[PDB]
């Protein structure tokens with residue numbers, strides 16, 4: 007089994023697995039049952055920006071999603087991620103649709119990890135994605151579209167979202183998330199994303215996740231499990 | 240009166256103003272009486288590195304000081320700094336000696352502030368300081384030495400620390416610490432510093448601080464008040 | 473007299489002072505008479521992005537302006553800027569209108585200077601400008617508009633460009649452009665800009681410039697002299 | 706055959722393959738026969754810092770090596786690297802010893818590539834290397850030592866350099882060096898390195914190189930060919 011820490015922009019309330027009754031930004035530590043969620047007013051067809059921030063000192067994982075109108079949801083959770091994740095991880099984004107659907111279009115994604123000036127660093131930014139993103143590991147239905155967008159989940163050539171889709175994109179390089187001689191490890195990610203749904207109910211969301219390097223889509227992870235967990239423990 | 244948030248590497252226990260009975264890393268919000276301290280084992284004549292991290296989402300200000308031997312003290316405090324500081328601040332380092340003394344030598348200092356990709360950013364790094372640091376505002380006894388070091392407090396040409404010294408160095412540019420249309424503001428600072436003392440009691444420490452732009456050394460701030468406060472309320 | 477190095481996005485051919493017969497991107501060293509220009513197809517009312525790159529090793533100053541349609545002009549000039557500029561400079565943007573006019577709207581501007589890991593660094597980014605940009609020194613008619621844009625030159629509240637306008641914006645902090653113990657100094661700037669003109673002839677352009685710290689708008693610099701020179705030597 | 710662009714810190718004059726009669730910093734485009742070299746005064750057992758800078762606009766590849774005493778060699782060569790390298794490359798460091806030997810110890814290495822703010826970016830920094838650098842692809846004799854150093858070539862446990870060694874370290878992620886919709890691509894690398902030799906003749910040097918993603922050590926590349934070419938055409 008994989009080790010996952012994720013920030014989930016969960017668009018669809020699967021009450022049977024813990025979701026509150028609304029679209030929510032969630033922090034998931036090792037289970038889809040978010041440790042802490044916050045109500046997220048999903049704005050259909052509008053570009054959101056998610057920032058995820060953490061440092062080893064503060065031991066607080068935070069996520070804020072905003073929409074250009076200045077609306078945001080935020081979630082923070084105290085967690086010491088060195089205690090959680092292996093040292094090397096890959097970082098990535100996940101999406102699923104299920105019975106309900108949405109585009110899970112990533113417009114841009116940037117990530118910075120620092121292991122501290124005898125600091126190590128990884129930083130990447132995609133403001134554009136290409137037909138053949140060699141530094142991204144595309145899993146499941148993830149593809150880059152004609153528009154330099156990352157479609158984490160299947161969209162018909164007419165960009166109608168498809169259901170029962172799971173996709174992920176991990177950065178090609180493993181990331182050294184916390185070393186035992188490390189004083190401080192911090193990371194921050196940002197991606198902007200377009201969730202549009204013909205459905206008045208979008209499903210299921212997009213995560214940014216940190217996983218064990220080897221992580222692949224868990225069979226069973228479609229839909230509400232956001233391509234991250236093989237079940238909802 | 241100035242508005243100060245500071246991370247104090249306080250080398251000298253002034254019990255009468257709240258210090259615990261030891262050298263301590265402290266988070267000071269608007270008073271020298273640290274909101275949260277942590278024991279710091281002061282390693283004389285050894286270079287320390289302090290990192291200070293904060294983001295508006297997590298609302299947690301963290302500081303970790305380490306010495307090359309892998310020894311560290313850390314302090315975190317939940318504070319929402321937008322609630323505290325004006326929007327524009329200057330950032331800086333402070334030191335004082337008092338009756339007891341130490342070199343308050345800054346070897347390097349880097350700082351990053353981000354107001355979030357429609358992000359604004361300021362970043363600076365001094366791994367070296369020059370005779371005439373035009374992007375630093377030197378206050379009090381702060382000078383740059385023949386060694387490209389920032390001596391926040393007076394050192395005789397033989398580098399014997401002097402007592403009753405206060406100095407500061409603020410970066411020349413004001414920093415836009417939190418804007419009201421801002422979704423996320425984060426900053427992180429790092430400086431390395433050489434506290435050496437002939438005295439078996441060093442005094443008084445070095446801070447990294449965030450202040451109102453106009454901040455000058457408060458008369459009365461020498462010694463235990465680390466060039467930051469005009470009294471110990 | 474000031475010392476100026478500038479990359480000029482010159483929209484108006486003032487043949488009497490050297491301009492080629494077209495809108496041109498120019499590299500100006502110490503005179504408005506560009507050392508090297510390249511034809512620039514000015515795209516009215518379309519956002520351009522200018523990048524300016526230099527490092528002390530290569531001793532080549534390059535500028536590329538592009539428009540979202542993938543059209544670009546580029547200009548490079550071999551120059552050793554340490555030989556030219558003082559050590560400390562301020563960096564900035566300039567615009568003028570003259571008899572002919574245009575909006576000289578800066579949407580964003582980022583700048584990085586490095587004096588090299590015993591590297592020093594300044595980096596700033598404005599993706600937004602505010603009513604009171606405390607880290608920008610606004611000169612002449614430069615103001616920030618209701619839209620978080622930098623209007624280097626006067627625009628009526630209806631955003632009609634005005635003529636005979638000069639404005640500049642320098643970053644508040646001096647920049648240490650080349651030190652004598654320095655091995656490598658590099659800088660890169662990027663700004664995006666909206667030149668729109670009711671006129672079928674826009675005038676006069678926008679520069680990014682490096683100047684002596686103290687630089688103010690030279691009396692006489694309006695119009696074709698882009699707020700940079702007091703004459704056209 | 707691989708495609709290589711390299712900056713070679715060549716410590717040993719192999720006159721039969723073009724080297725000038727001295728240790729030299731060289732720019733190698735697609736052959737070990739440097740397009741442009743500059744005399745390098747090899748300082749035994751002293752840490753050097755190499756910076757390599759390039760941008761697509763200037764089309765000038767520059768390298769400067771310095772030693773803490775302020776001594777440097779520099780080499781620049783006009784080359785348009787998009788014309789040369791595929792779009793995706795891996796970046797790396799190479800070293801060899803041959804009959805003559807040296808430690809080819811990398812202390813730190815940082816790299817930045819930008820494909821331009823709709824900029825893409827990769828940045829990494831190793832100020833330390835670990836026993837199991839998962840984001841580095843170690844080839845040949847490259848290992849990380851007990852000291853967090855990258856020993857590109859074999860060193861006995863007593864750190865005596867061995868002869869006939871070749872090693873490389875490529876960053877795990879492919880790098881998107883130039884895209885056809887790209888306006889500007891720039892990269893800069895920096896690494897610091899300790900060449901120490903018991904021999905009064907060190908051999909053979911260290912390169913920073915850009916290669917086709919798939920690049921492995923070319924059989925035949927030991928010694929003077931710096932692990933980069935299968936012959937000296």
Ligand SMILES: OC[C@H]1O[C@H](Oc2c[nH]c3ccc(Br)c(Cl)c23)[C@@H](O)[C@@H](O)[C@@H]1O
Pocket residue numbers: 018020103104105106107209210228229230231
């Ligand atoms: O995409 C939204 C949800 O669709 C499915 O769950 C259902 C939501 N409403 C339903 C109604 C009937 C049936 Br059968 C199902 Cl599975 C569902 C499942 O695929 C869930 O994983 C997913 O979260």
Ligand SMILES: OC[C@H]1O[C@H](Oc2c[nH]c3ccc(Br)c(Cl)c23)[C@@H](O)[C@@H](O)[C@@H]1O
Pocket residue numbers: 251253336337338339340442443461462463464
């Ligand atoms: O530098 C250490 C301390 O020196 C002075 O305080 C004293 C510490 N021990 C003392 C003993 C006698 C007297 Br008088 C004084 Cl002020 C002190 C004061 O300057 C304090 O501000 C400072 O923290």
Ligand SMILES: OC[C@H]1O[C@H](Oc2c[nH]c3ccc(Br)c(Cl)c23)[C@@H](O)[C@@H](O)[C@@H]1O
Pocket residue numbers: 484486569570571572573675676694695696697
């Ligand atoms: O803004 C475009 C140009 O306007 C003026 O120059 C003229 C261009 N065409 C003209 C026609 C008549 C007169 Br008078 C003038 Cl000054 C001009 C001057 O203000 C120039 O500085 C400026 O470059």
Ligand SMILES: OC[C@H]1O[C@H](Oc2c[nH]c3ccc(Br)c(Cl)c23)[C@@H](O)[C@@H](O)[C@@H]1O
Pocket residue numbers: 717719802803804805806908909927928929930
């Ligand atoms: O390491 C320095 C050089 O050693 C060898 O070349 C020689 C330099 N001096 C020699 C003397 C005799 C013989 Br045989 C050889 Cl191969 C050499 C070869 O391995 C060269 O590749 C290498 O550059």
Ligand SMILES: [Ca+2]
Pocket residue numbers: 016017018019020025210230
């Ligand atoms: Ca859900």
Ligand SMILES: [Ca+2]
Pocket residue numbers: 249250251252253258443463
């Ligand atoms: Ca004290």
Ligand SMILES: [Ca+2]
Pocket residue numbers: 482483484485486491676696
């Ligand atoms: Ca002109």
Ligand SMILES: [Ca+2]
Pocket residue numbers: 715716717718719724909929
């Ligand atoms: Ca050689």
Ligand SMILES: [Mn+2]
Pocket residue numbers: 014016025026030032038040
């Ligand atoms: Mn959920």
Ligand SMILES: [Mn+2]
Pocket residue numbers: 247249258259263265271273
């Ligand atoms: Mn204290």
Ligand SMILES: [Mn+2]
Pocket residue numbers: 480482491492496498504506
């Ligand atoms: Mn011109």
Ligand SMILES: [Mn+2]
Pocket residue numbers: 713715724725729731737739
């Ligand atoms: Mn050579």
